[PDB]
Write a protein that binds this DNA or RNA. Structure first.
Ligand SMILES: [Mg+2]
Length: 1260
RNA sequence: UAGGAGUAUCCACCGCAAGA
RNA sequence: UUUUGCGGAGUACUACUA
């Protein structure tokens, strides 16, 4: 119970010592860490890097492939149908056999066509046929495949087969020939993609967006090529199954114009697999790269271009499947941004070229382009801002090799764009990256380069090259810490250097080293604010689970991964958190408290493993999987520092995930309020000075790696709380002491890769030297990333306040404003300075007099006071292990960025493409209702974040169509409700299918399942008006669902991810024991037991619950997407605990609802269910239907945007035993709107209705 | 090099029977 | 290193906050 700990004793250093040190520091000429942006400077950087690039990578004469799928279209494309497929295949094979092969790929294509066209009739009846109507015919062993034996191949075909089944260089970007060729080729590709092929919601949609965006895009070749590529990717997905990838296959599209030959390949349901295919197409306008075509066969007034043997992974294939939809979403978002910026609808040519560019980017899913765009998204803020570290960003840009031809075009475009942006510094002009039109607001530009960036999927890195990269950042900084320990001394590095040591050395102010006096002073300045709210601090600290038993919280028993025990091999075993909780409970006598658990697990060493986050950035970041004692320590420290963090301002990680924007906008508004007026400074009779603001959007170089975790200890020893005795503080200090050293474990993938290396070249031996035994190494000082995320931000705020106090002491005469926002490494600093008026000759005289008086430090305030302010702030932050990165820090007079949001004065620009495009590339997979809700719920989030209602409606339509195609619910597919349900496909329960297309306003206000609920109401109304059999029929379906993600009446699994093995402790108790015990203790399904035996039984039951079990197995997203698209035709419905097709569930529902009769209990339950629970949602739709809209003549000039807000005992009810009594007793939406819109719950809906038209204002 | 990735050597399938 | 006949091959995912 809180063991006695030695704690720490204050050093008692004075603030005046730091003031004297700062005076000495500022009495000298200090170089600036940033470079002012100029067109000449950017041009010089580009020229020098271009000249020096050729010496780094070997020169290459052959630009490499950049198109994953090459296909050309000349006529309108219709969706593929099985009959529209057989005839196309016949004509296509006739055309191919007419041709003459040239290359081995052409020989393989010819052999495939000759084999296909000579298949007998019986196979082709079995071909193109479903599973039920399919039989093996000695030539077709799967519904859509055919066998091609090696004996049925020519010499060149088997040579190509042997090639398939049997140093980095960069293009000379400095040359003008390479740039000219790349630009000429990609301009031609874009031009061919741009060619033309020979209620209130719907009213406004058709008037504004459909007429000006969709109607324009319906005729472009990019639209129909995207449809064709969707068809090709669907054919590849169907063929890539676990039983169809063995054999070959031929498909045809566009009247035999595009022919897809799928070769045998590893099935995509296995890791490290590629789908291998060829595509033959008549040469014409389209996505044709003639240089990288394998062959161009020639016939009479015909050119058939045969592409190379492409190998596409599952991620790129699924990206290409949704390429057209992603391009359309991106184009609609631009369209909205252009309308907001220029106030008029974009012209035809611009809206066609933008769509072509977005589609081309969506098709070319390559990592090099993703890295280039990731660098560009940081380069653009650098050149626009007044001061930034743009030379470092340009060097990183030039780091990569430009092997492809698309990368050279993108590089040329970004070079021209950056030179133009820098030349127009000092409502400005901002040229568009894809279009010729210029912009009036910077938010529009950084939002076309963000939307362009987000078209690339997550996880395009190498599966083994990037596994070794994530360890390097940790190992290199651990080695640097070891070097500092050996050089300066272990005691000095861990404890910290005194002020006099820094003064004598003047080199100790480095990363991974902290100054004891600085830490104490920062803690004192934080206590200066904590003294007022000491009572609240004590209350919040005691509100933390200090005495509540462990493993009774959601965090301590969850599905999150956790390091297990060191295996016999030596690697750190990976396991579920709940598994480790069950183990510990089984190996313990009683459920322990947090502090008791810390007492038992204090001696054990912290251990961790690093695993990829699968990001879309240039370099993948890794997150650390920590073991159980490490989790306990980190929980103690994070709870103690989260209690304090919530009680002070300028701390933004402690705030909510939605309140951050509100708080930062309030801070910016306060800063702007200070800017009003003028400051009078005493001559000692006043001088007038103009108040000016400067925003520094900062980002620390290294937060986790380049840090010393010991600096918190002394900090914790000085932070003042309202607790009577410093016992909890001592416990937290001890926990910080025990987390100093960590056993960083190399991943299994990396150790196998290094074991199979066979030649340990340099830069790998040095990395392997960190692990002495070859499996783990000691990391000191570094607290693993993610952990301690609130303590670090609190420390940063403390250091910022220390700098503020130091600056106030240094220059008492001047009045300056300081606003700080610290969200972990991300930070924003608003400094205020007094610029003199009329040349400030009196100000210069005052400065000269001050220097003559004896103040040698005033040499840093005569001109550009903000430079001195930032220099002192950076140095004082460097007294701790906080270095502000010269690379990704921007100094601007007007614009700013914080938390990946852009601020122009008080205006905030939340990107919503991250949300819209995210609604299309993933799915929970729990069920059709649970997928539709997830797809629609994201589009509501975008609508809150600033998406226009028309763009949100279009994205909703695209997501609904994609979901319907995925599960087959769409009309004309296998799982169409209308065929087996005696309905119009509109009055079908949502869990069973039916039209999920809803008004965006209905989802925004009423809810996501609203239509389903509406159905019930309508049905009930029928049964209360006409006693119609149809309504009674709908009533039977709802009862059927209840007898058989959001919480409602849903029809129990559609997810198929069942485990391949039983878990470690799933069989601890027999099923009879759990079945009896669940009935004996009814409440335990609502609250978590606090007794070991009861908690152990509850956890074991949680291990045997199918709902929990299926969630553990699902670890890799989009594999459910692939499996659903491959097998919507059969194998899954969860009918009476049996895996059958969904059609049988539809038939069973039909039978049940046909043999269903109305009873008093069910009807009364339905009447209560519809009236009571939905009493608020029905009113929401009634308000929507009780509204009217009319357009008044006035163009919509958007104003500044703001952020607003949208506005236990059950265990007692069934409680029986005294232990249950104790258990229950112990247990007990931000939106972006305009300026004029208030925070009323209905005013936001009124604004959403008002913003229906992007150009013409309307009145509600 | 036919593709993905890369100035980290990777992925691009696994077994049996029978014949050479 | 190959040919034929068979059978198969379900993807490690942290604390953080509404
Ligand atoms: Mg930032």
């Amino acid at each position: 119970y809180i063991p006695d700990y030695k704690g720490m004793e204050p050093i008692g250093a004075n603030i005046e010592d730091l003031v004297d040190y700062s005076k000495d520091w500022l009495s000298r000429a200090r170089n600036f860490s940033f470079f002012e942006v100029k067109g000449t400077a950017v041009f010089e950087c580009f020229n020098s890097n271009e000249a020096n690039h050729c010496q780094r990578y070997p020169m290459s004469r052959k630009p490499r492939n950049f198109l994953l799928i090459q296909c050309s279209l000349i006529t309108s494309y219709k969706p593929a149908t099985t009959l529209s497929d057989q005839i196309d295949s016949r004509r296509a094979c006739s055309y191919i056999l007419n041709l003459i092969p040239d290359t081995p790929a052409s020989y393989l294509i010819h052999d495939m066509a000759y084999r296909y066209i000579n298949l007998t009739r019986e196979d082709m009846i079995n071909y193109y046929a479903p599973r039920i109507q399919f039989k093996q015919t000695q030539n077709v062993r799967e519904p859509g495949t055919f066998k091609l034996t090696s004996s049925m191949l020519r010499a060149e075909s088997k040579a190509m087969l042997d090639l398939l089944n049997n140093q980095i260089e960069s293009l000379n970007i400095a040359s003008h020939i390479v740039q000219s060729e790349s630009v000429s080729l990609i301009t031609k590709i874009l031009s061919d993609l741009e060619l033309n092929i020979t209620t209130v919601l719907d009213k406004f949609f058709q008037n504004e967006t459909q007429k000006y965006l969709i109607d324009v895009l319906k005729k472009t070749t990019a639209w129909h090529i995207g449809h064709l590529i969707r068809d090709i990717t669907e054919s590849l997905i169907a063929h890539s199954g676990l039983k169809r990838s063995k054999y070959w296959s031929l498909h045809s599209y566009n009247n035999g114009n595009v022919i897809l030959f799928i070769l045998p390949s590893k099935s995509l349901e296995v890791a490290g697999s590629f789908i291998r295919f060829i595509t033959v197409f008549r040469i014409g306008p389209g996505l044709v790269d003639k240089d990288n075509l394998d062959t161009i066969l020639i016939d009479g007034d015909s050119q058939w271009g045969v592409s190379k043997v492409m190998s596409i992974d599952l991620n790129r294939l699924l990206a290409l499947n949704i390429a057209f939809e992603k391009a359309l979403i991106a184009t609609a978002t631009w369209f909205q941004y252009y309308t907001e910026d220029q106030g008029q609808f974009p012209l035809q040519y611009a809206i066609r070229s933008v769509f072509a560019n977005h589609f081309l980017l969506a098709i070319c899913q390559k990592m090099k382009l993703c890295a280039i765009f990731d660098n560009l998204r940081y380069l653009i803020p650098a050149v626009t801002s007044l001061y930034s570290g743009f030379p470092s960003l340009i060097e990183k840009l030039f780091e990569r090799p430009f092997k492809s031809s698309l990368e050279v075009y993108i590089y040329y475009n970004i070079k021209s764009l950056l030179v133009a942006l820098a030349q127009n510094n000092k409502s400005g002009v901002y040229p568009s990256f894809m279009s010729r039109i210029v912009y009036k607001h910077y938010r529009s530009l950084i939002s076309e380069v963000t939307t362009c960036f987000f078209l690339f999927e997550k996880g395009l890195h190498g599966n083994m090259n990037e596994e070794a990269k994530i360890h390097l950042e940790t190992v290199e900084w651990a080695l640097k810490f070891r070097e500092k320990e050996e050089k300066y001394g272990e005691s000095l590095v861990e404890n910290g250097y005194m002020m006099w040591e820094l003064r004598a050395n003047a080199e100790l102010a480095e990363q991974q080293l902290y100054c004891q006096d600085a830490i104490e002073l920062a803690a004192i300045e934080l206590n200066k604010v904590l003294a007022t709210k000491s009572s609240v601090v004590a209350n919040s600290i005691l509100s933390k689970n200090w005495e509540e038993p462990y493993f009774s919280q959601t965090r301590n028993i969850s599905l999150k991964g956790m390091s297990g025990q060191v295996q016999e091999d030596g690697h750190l075993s990976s396991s579920v958190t709940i598994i480790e909780a069950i183990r510990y409970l089984s190996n313990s006598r009683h459920n322990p408290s947090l502090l008791k658990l810390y007492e038992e697990t204090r001696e054990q060493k912290a251990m961790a493993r690093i695993v990829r986050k699968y990001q879309r950035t240039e370099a993948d970041r890794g997150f650390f999987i920590t073991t159980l004692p490490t989790r306990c320590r980190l929980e103690i420290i994070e709870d103690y520092y989260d209690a304090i963090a919530k009680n002070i301002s300028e701390e933004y990680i402690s705030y909510g995930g939605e309140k951050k924007i509100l708080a930062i906008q309030g801070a910016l508004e306060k800063a702007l309020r200070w800017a009003s007026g003028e400051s009078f400074i005493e001559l000692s009779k006043f001088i007038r000075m103009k108040r000016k603001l400067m925003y520094v959007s900062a980002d620390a170089t290294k937060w986790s790696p380049g840090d010393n975790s010991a600096k918190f200890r002394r900090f914790t020893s000085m932070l003042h709380n309202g607790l009577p005795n410093n016992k909890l503080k001592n416990c937290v200090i001890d926990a910080l002491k025990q987390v100093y050293k960590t056993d960083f474990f190399m991943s299994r993938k990396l150790r196998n890769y290094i074991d199979s290396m066979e030649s340990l070249d340099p830069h790998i031996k040095q990395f392997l030297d960190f692990f002495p035994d070859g499996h783990h190494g000691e990391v000191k000082g570094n607290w693993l990333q993610g952990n301690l995320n609130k303590c670090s931000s609190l420390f940063g705020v403390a250091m910022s306040l220390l700098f503020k106090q130091v600056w106030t002491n240094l220059f008492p005469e001047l009045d300056c404003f300081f606003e700080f926002a610290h969200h972990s490494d991300d930070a924003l600093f608003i400094y205020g300075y007094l610029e003199p008026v009329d040349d400030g000759t009196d100000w210069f005289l005052f400065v000269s007099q001050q220097i003559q008086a004896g103040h040698l430090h005033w040499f840093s305030v005569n001109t550009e006071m903000w430079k001195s302010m930032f220099n002192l702030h950076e140095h004082i932050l460097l007294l701790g292990s906080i270095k502000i990165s010269p690379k990704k820090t921007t100094v601007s007079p007007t614009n700013a960025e914080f938390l990946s949001t852009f601020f122009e004065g008080c205006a905030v620009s939340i990107p919503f493409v991250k949300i819209l495009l995210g609604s299309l590339s993933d799915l929970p997979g729990l069920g059709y209702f649970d997928d539709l809700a997830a797809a629609q719920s994201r589009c509501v989030k975008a609508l809150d974040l600033g998406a226009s209602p028309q763009v949100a409606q279009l994205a909703v339509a695209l997501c609904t169509s994609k979901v319907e195609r995925l599960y087959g619910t769409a009309p004309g597919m296998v799982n169409h409700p209308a065929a087996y349900l005696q309905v119009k496909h509109t009055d079908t329960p949502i869990p069973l299918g039916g039209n999920g297309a809803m008004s965006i306003m209905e989802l925004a206000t009423a809810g996501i399942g609203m239509s389903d609920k509406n159905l019930l109401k309508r049905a009930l109304l029928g049964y209360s008006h006409k006693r119609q059999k149809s309504m009674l029929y709908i009533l039977g379906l709802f009862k059927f669902l209840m007898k058989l993600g959001q919480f409602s009446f849903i029809g129990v699994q559609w997810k198929i991810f069942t485990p391949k093995s039983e878990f470690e402790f799933a069989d601890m108790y027999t099923s009879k024991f759990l079945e009896l015990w669940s009935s004996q203790h009814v409440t335990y399904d609502y609250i978590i037991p606090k007794g070991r035996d009861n908690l152990l039984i509850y956890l074991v039951r949680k291990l045997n619950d199918p709902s929990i079990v299926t969630a553990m197995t699902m670890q890799s997203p989009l594999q459910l997407r692939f499996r659903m698209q491959a097998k919507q035709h059969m194998k899954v419905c969860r009918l009476d605990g049996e895996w059958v097709t969904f059609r049988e569930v539809l038939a069973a529902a039909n039978s049940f609802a046909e043999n269903y009769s109305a009873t008093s209990q069910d009807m009364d339950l339905f009447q209560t269910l519809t009236s009571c629970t939905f009493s608020k949602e029905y009113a929401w739709k009634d308000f929507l239907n009780g509204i009217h809209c009319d357009v008044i003549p006035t163009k919509q000039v958007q104003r500044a945007k703001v952020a607003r807000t949208f506005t236990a005992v059950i265990g007692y009810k069934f409680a029986v035993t005294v232990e249950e009594m104790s258990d229950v007793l112990d247990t007990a939406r931000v939106v972006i709107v305009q300026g004029n819109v208030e925070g009323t719950a209905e005013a936001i809906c009124r604004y959403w209705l008002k913003s229906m038209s992007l150009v013409k204002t309307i009145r509600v």
